């Protein structure tokens, strides 16, 4: 949680001079991160979810949340209330441990990477990016799983505009190209 402290010291004064936030609490405080994986193909392979559930527990320090079906749809052939989603949400100090794991051992391992695009901001200062692999995390043991399960990780904040949250990420030497 060293970047937790880094945020509370260098970043706070860094934005109070650029944007001139008259109040201390008036800062884009990052709330939570949610490593999601809409596996979805559990329609037959019930154990596909078991690997992905264990994979999230392996990468992130907690048991995931098995998500059911919010609605019945025949285009994908699912009925409402059935195991199809695999997600988690890091909140608090353990969210920083993953955030520390992000800029130092996760994002550096991004394949064919020369710049992170923050064009995936929802519109309310929250970034919901999605990468095609979990291999960027050394927690996966390469030959343990025969498939590099893609996923989507959302970084939730408290900002309003995209650039208020985009420059927020730049305060951690984030790739921008």
């Amino acid at each position: 949680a060293k970047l937790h402290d880094y945020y509370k010291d260098e970043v706070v004064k860094k934005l109070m001079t650029e944007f001139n936030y008259n109040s201390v609490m008036q800062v884009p405080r990052v709330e939570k991160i949610t490593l999601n994986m809409g596996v979805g193909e559990a329609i037959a392979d019930k154990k596909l979810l078991d690997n992905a559930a264990a994979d999230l527990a392996a990468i992130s320090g907690q048991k995931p949340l098995i998500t059911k079906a919010r609605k019945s749809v025949a285009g994908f052939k699912i009925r409402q209330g059935y195991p199809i989603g695999c997600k988690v949400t890091l909140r608090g100090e353990r969210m920083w441990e993953f955030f520390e794991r992000l800029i130092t051992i996760a994002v550096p391992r991004i394949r064919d990477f020369r710049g992170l695009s923050a064009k995936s901001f929802d519109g309310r200062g929250n970034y919901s990016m999605g990468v095609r692999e979990q291999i960027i995390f050394p927690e996966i043991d390469y030959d343990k799983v025969d498939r590099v399960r893609g996923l989507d990780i959302t970084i939730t904040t408290t900002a309003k505009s995209d650039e208020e949250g985009r420059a927020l990420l730049a305060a951690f030497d984030f790739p921008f190209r």
Partner: protein, 41 residues
């Protein structure tokens, strides 16, 4: 932080090709050495 549902934490000390050793609690099993890091961006 519910009991017996969370895999244990272990202070993981992994390095980089430059020697960027970082100690943080994680659940891996081993400590490997990497190619790039934050200092190698």
């Amino acid at each position: 932080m519910k009991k017996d549902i969370h895999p244990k934490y272990e202070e993981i000390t992994a390095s980089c090709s430059c020697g960027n050793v970082m100690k943080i609690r994680s659940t891996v099993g081993h400590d490997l050495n990497l190619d790039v890091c934050s200092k190698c961006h």
